[PDB]
Every structure is written in C-alpha cells, then in structure tokens.
Amino acid sequence: QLLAEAAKHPDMLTSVRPNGLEDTPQFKIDIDQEKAQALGVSINDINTTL
Amino acid sequence: LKVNQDGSRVLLRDVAKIELGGENYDIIAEFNGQPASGLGIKLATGANAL
Question: What is this protein's function per UniProt (chain B)?
Fold first, then answer.
C-alpha cells in the first residue's frame, strides 16, 4: 500500500523499493500422527530421517 | 496422546484444560483499586536518573 502511494509522487520520491525478498513457493509436508502411531513409527525417527 | 485398543483417539483436550494463562500467578497489582499491571524499573549503576 505504501509503495503504491510513493509511486504516485514521482515529483518527490524515486526508486522507492523494498530492500528484501518476496514470498516464494515452498513445500508443505504434514506428518499424520495417528497413522504414525498406528504403524509404530516414532516421530523422532521420522523428523530426523527427513 | 494415544490411540486406544478399539481405534478411538485420546486427544490432549480429553485429559487437560488448556488456556492462555500466566507463566506464574504470584503477582497481582491494582491502581487506586482497579486492575492494573506495570513495570518496576531500577536504574543501571552510575546512570543518570533524570
């Protein structure tokens, strides 16, 4: 919102921009606790394996 | 917490109450008799009070 308004006073502000990085794709992996417990597979073995 | 013999689930919410609540419950303050909180600030050594 702020960057859009800054861009509307080119008479005053120029190169007004973020210094950082923009959101990106990432991979959500959900460990199903019930199935893990039913198989007798420990969360700690799962998470350190991964 | 665990899966029972008959496949039913035991959730934490079944054996515990869960609530946001103080790390501790020892201090309670009041300002002219109404609920309050606040900060008690001590002065670093040798620093200027004002």
Answer: AcrA-AcrB-AcrZ-TolC is a drug efflux protein complex with broad substrate specificity that uses the proton motive force to export substrates.
CA atoms within 13 A on the CB side of B42: 2
Sign of CA dihedral A6, A7, A12, A17: positive
Rounded-to-integer distance, Cα A11 and Cα B40, Å:
49
The technique by which this structure was obtained is X-ray
Chain A interface includes B13 (CB < 8 A):
no
E-strand spans in chain A?
A: none
Please report, for residues A6, A18, A23, B42, the alpha-carbon distance to residue A1 in angstroms, rounded to integers and kept in the order given.
9, 12, 16, 42
Q: Which residue of A has its CA nearest to B8?
A: A34
Closest CA to A34 of B9, B27, B15, B12: B9
Give the tokens for residue A37.
């417990």
